[PDB]
């Protein structure tokens, strides 16, 4: 589990969104595994606006933050999961790192701010849903 709290937005994995998230929906995209809902309180996270390919992510299944090198956002085939069938997920970045299904929502960050959240993994890989192209998260 986990979310990004920027301005009056909450960014979560679409497959972990709550009823309150759907009832206060701003934007969702199943191909990216992302959903954004509105919040009453202002958040403290800042979004990175950069081309970094190195950063640090939080792994709840180890209670640890790990440094990682990650690929550029791309269209990748992801195996079946109970939340989605085997399909192509867009704006996904891969890295070598430990991940388990419940690690979804952990933040990946660089020196500029939040880059994305854990969305996929298995066998020593971890995948992150990028959010750096969502410029509207910085306004309204
Ligand atoms: C955290 O992902 C891990 C980790 C270890 C093993 C397997 C996975 C992958 C996994 O179960 N999923 C990838 C999902 C997707 N984004 O389509 C999101 C949750 C389902 C579907
Ligand atoms: Zn950066």
Curated annotation (Swiss-Prot):
Function in brief: Cysteine protease that cleaves viral polyprotein and specific host proteins. It is responsible for the autocatalytic cleavage between the P1 and P2 regions, which is the first cleavage occurring in the polyprotein. Also cleaves the host translation initiation factor EIF4G1, in order to shut down the capped cellular mRNA translation. Inhibits the host nucleus-cytoplasm protein and RNA trafficking by cleaving host members of the nuclear pores. Counteracts stress granule formation probably by antagonizing its assembly or promoting its dissassembly.
Superkingdom field: Viruses
UniProt-annotated binding residues for Zn(2+) 1: 50, 52, 110, 112
Subunit structure: Homodimer.
Catalytic activity: Selective cleavage of Tyr-|-Gly bond in the picornavirus polyprotein
Cystine pairs: none
Residue positions of the active site: 15 (for protease 2a activity), 33 (for protease 2a activity), 104 (for protease 2a activity)
Portion held of the full protein: 869 to 1008 of 2193
Name of this protein: Protease 2A
């Amino acid at each position: 589990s986990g979310a990004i709290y920027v301005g009056n937005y909450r960014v979560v994995n679409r497959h972990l969104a709550t009823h309150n998230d759907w009832a206060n929906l701003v934007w969702e995209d199943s191909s990216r595994d992302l959903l954004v809902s509105s919040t009453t309180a202002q958040g403290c996270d800042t979004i990175a606006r950069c081309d970094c390919q190195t950063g640090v992510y939080y792994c709840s299944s180890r209670r640890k933050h790990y440094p990682v090198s990650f690929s550029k956002p791309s269209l990748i085939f992801v195996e079946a999961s109970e939340y989605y069938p085997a399909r192509y997920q867009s704006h996904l970045m891969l890295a070598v790192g430990h991940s388990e299904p419940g690690d979804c929502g952990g933040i990946l960050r660089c020196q500029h701010g939040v880059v994305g959240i854990v969305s996929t993994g298995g066998n020593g890989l971890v995948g992150f849903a990028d959010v750096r192209d969502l410029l509207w998260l910085d306004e309204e």
